Swiss-Prot record, chains A, B:
Sequence ranges on the Cytoplasmic membrane side: 1-398
Task of the protein: Serine/threonine-protein kinase and endoribonuclease that acts as a key sensor for the endoplasmic reticulum unfolded protein response (UPR). In unstressed cells, the endoplasmic reticulum luminal domain is maintained in its inactive monomeric state by binding to the endoplasmic reticulum chaperone HSPA5/BiP. Accumulation of misfolded proteins in the endoplasmic reticulum causes release of HSPA5/BiP, allowing the luminal domain to homodimerize, promoting autophosphorylation of the kinase domain and subsequent activation of the endoribonuclease activity.
Subunit structure of this chain's protein: Monomer. Homodimer; disulfide-linked; homodimerization takes place in response to endoplasmic reticulum stress and promotes activation of the kinase and endoribonuclease activities. Dimer formation is driven by hydrophobic interactions within the N-terminal luminal domains and stabilized by disulfide bridges. Interacts (via the luminal region) with DNAJB9/ERdj4; interaction takes place in unstressed cells and promotes recruitment of HSPA5/BiP.
Domain Protein kinase: residue ranges: 10-267
Name by which UniProt lists this protein: Serine/threonine-protein kinase/endoribonuclease IRE1
Result for mutant: residue 265 to L: In an ovarian serous carcinoma sample; somatic mutation
Coiled-coil regions listed: none
Modified residues (Phosphoserine): 163
Residue window of the full protein shown: 562 to 963 of 977
Chain's gene name: ERN1
Length: 398, 398
């Protein structure tokens, strides 16, 4: 048997998966396209109408699933949406990450862009989780992308409203959604909390900041989280830790907006990381040693530099830097100056110094972030003071 | 009377416009959306099938019109596509540009991105013109965008094919499409030619490089073009001239690809223009005065600098530059060094010098491009020598 309800066609044997309250998702056809066909019981008709409306408003963004058509009969309602290759859950559960490069982080970036688009339309998702972040089928050039789906529980905030009244999948629910200690009503940042748990789930390849599945939601309410898959002496893990712990903060007002998340160093290219180092080096160049900028930059600076940073770089660099200026080994500012100096004059340096540094910009900046895993995170926090100036708008969100 | 053919609905009184060979475009409805409904006579059924197929392949890009559904009856075929607010023709014919800022150039950028997407799918449009570049209706944040439409005459090149055999709207047709002197078959660059004529049509607010409409196509075949709406001593017009004359070159092999067009200074922000000046200044710093780079950079450099560039800047800058280095007034390289110098030390300079320059980066770079209208175009051409190096990949297409 093969079902045809209006312009939507599918065969009941092609079941892709199941949702809540009797929802089934089939592989099907619409307008000679392969599509996913979502079948909703009459008890959930008000959720399908909500989903259809909110998909019409937001599916123009590439990281929101495309919506095609809807139709009803006597029995059910049918929603035709973009057919996808996998969920993020099975991507994390099945794909070998060793040879995927930055693709996992790109999926998180695309998820966040789709979330930012929803929030810019005053839509809160409220049920974000790996099960409904979808991985597209490859396009004509083999590229895949993440898409947000499943809009049955979304809330459309009225014009002039920033909060909603008080719904999700246990284990991924922001605490202010379930605790009665609700000073403020929940807002867009409930999606930031869930996203933060998703971020950790992807980069840890399967763990959750609030533990194993049976205890997860109870740990969220207690604030008991652990990010120990992130090693504290690895640059990439330090950066990810800094972002994720803000995304999952118990206080919703301390969580960054989606657009704020998108500006974080977690997503910067290596080229952009080096440009941030150069730009901060120039900003603090003629700065006062007693000023608030260099004060913030040097507070806790001893551990960032490893007591004396000149003792923690390769000898060919160490012999080269003694000649011209001779820098201060306990200053983070002086570490940044040496980096800036060696990048600007990179092609004047002898072949021995260009060898241990590597090429500009990627290898060069990794020479430093590998050996000073806290440098970028520390510098990024200190220079929040300059987040409003023009030079630093590529790096901070206003 | 109100027509309903399948899931497409429209009323024959809501005519938006007409196309070739009896095609009519109506305002209509599909799935409770407002849509454009394209009605095609049986004589053009093979073109509607071509359009439906190629829209299915390419409408995912934001600057290709979105396709919704198609249906037939006894009489006609109907295509439901995104409803748009205007054509580029009426935009140019009716909108006051004085208060639109960079919006016209952004429309050209978006058109080119849609074209690049088609070409990346081995689709040549072959009938690009202001009449079928559409202006979207504003989104929820008031923003508009350009979209390519009308795919009835598109060619899908077979896998492994780069040319097609030998169709358009008179006045916008690349010469190799009509002249029998066809050494090479037409390729994607027929769309570049048309686009180049569209570029000039927008920035001149209604003119065409090959003249008035009755003589246009005859001038194309003769190679007789004129871009004299572009003043030769205005930076923005110099840059646009440089691009447009390559886009409309008679020799198709001299026209840049769509992705090449997208990298041209015509589309650079002011910030990016200044960064190009700084990056070239650093690249030629320790360069040999006899080398090929500085040779190319100085060839024809006297007119770029206006005999002596130190005599063509404001006196407060002139008094400031004499102090430290004292530069050479006939060298383009030295002009670039002074610029680079004053940007790097911008906050060390006295208030008089920061005043006549303006703020970084926008006013600062305009101080120089306003007074040396050929500087950027000249520097961009000379430094094509370095187009392959890593530092200059933001500026040239490989
Ligand atoms: O709103 C929606 C939209 C979609 C959806 N829309 N296009 C899709 N293409 C493929 C799949 C899919 C699958 F079903 C199982 C394994 C791999 C797959 F790729 C799902 C798709 N699916 C759900 N559900 C609820 C949450 C469940 O975890 C999954 C099904 N809800
Ligand atoms: O393939 C296509 C798709 C569309 C099309 N698709 N959505 C549209 N929304 C609005 C308009 C539109 C109009 F019709 C007249 C004035 C202002 C407008 F905005 C046209 C639209 N139109 C044509 N034609 C052929 C070339 C003609 O110059 C125009 C009509 N061809």
């Amino acid at each position: 048997s093969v079902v045809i309800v209006g312009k939507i066609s599918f065969c009941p044997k092609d079941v892709l998966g199941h949702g809540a309250e009797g929802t089934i998702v089939y592989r099907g056809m619409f307008d000679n396209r392969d599509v996913a066909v979502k079948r909703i019981l009459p008890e959930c008709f008000s959720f399908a109408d909500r989903e259809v409306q909110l998909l019409r408003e937001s599916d123009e963004h590439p990281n929101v699933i495309r919506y095609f058509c809807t139709e009803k009969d006597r029995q059910f309602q049918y929603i035709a949406i973009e057919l996808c290759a996998a969920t993020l859950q099975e991507y994390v559960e099945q794909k070998d990450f060793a040879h995927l490069g930055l693709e996992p982080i790109t999926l998180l970036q695309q998820t966040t862009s789709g979330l930012a688009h929803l929030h810019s339309l005053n839509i809160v998702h409220r049920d974000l989780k790996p099960h409904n972040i979808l991985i597209s089928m490859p396009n004509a050039h083999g590229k895949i992308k993440a898409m947000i789906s499943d809009f049955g529980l979304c809330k459309k905030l009225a014009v002039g409203r920033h909060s909603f009244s008080r719904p999700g999948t246990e284990g991924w629910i922001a605490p202010e959604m379930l605790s009665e200690d609700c000073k403020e009503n929940p807002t867009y940042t409930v999606d930031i909390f869930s996203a933060g748990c998703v971020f950790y789930y992807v980069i840890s390849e399967g763990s959750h900041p609030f533990g194993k599945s049976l205890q997860r939601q109870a740990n969220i309410l207690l604030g008991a989280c652990s990010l120990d898959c992130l090693h504290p002496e690895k640059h990439e893990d330090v950066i990810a830790r800094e972002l994720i712990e803000k995304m999952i903060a118990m206080d919703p007002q301390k969580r960054p907006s989606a657009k704020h998340v998108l500006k974080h160093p977690f997503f910067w290219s290596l080229e952009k990381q080096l440009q941030f180092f150069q730009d901060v080096s120039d900003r603090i160049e003629k700065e006062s040693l007693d000023g608030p900028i260099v004060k913030q930059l040097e507070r806790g600076g001893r551990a960032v530099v490893k007591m004396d940073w000149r003792e923690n770089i390769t000898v060919p660099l160490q012999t080269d830097l003694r000649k011209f200026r001779t820098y201060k080994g306990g200053s983070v500012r002086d570490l940044l100056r040496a980096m800036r100096n060696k990048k600007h004059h990179y092609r004047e340096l002898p072949a021995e110094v260009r060898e241990t540094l590597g090429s500009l910009p990627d290898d060069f900046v990794c020479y430093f972030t590998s050996r000073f895993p806290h440098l970028l995170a520390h510098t990024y926090r200190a220079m929040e003071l300059c987040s409003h100036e023009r030079l630093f708008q590529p790096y901070y969100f206003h």
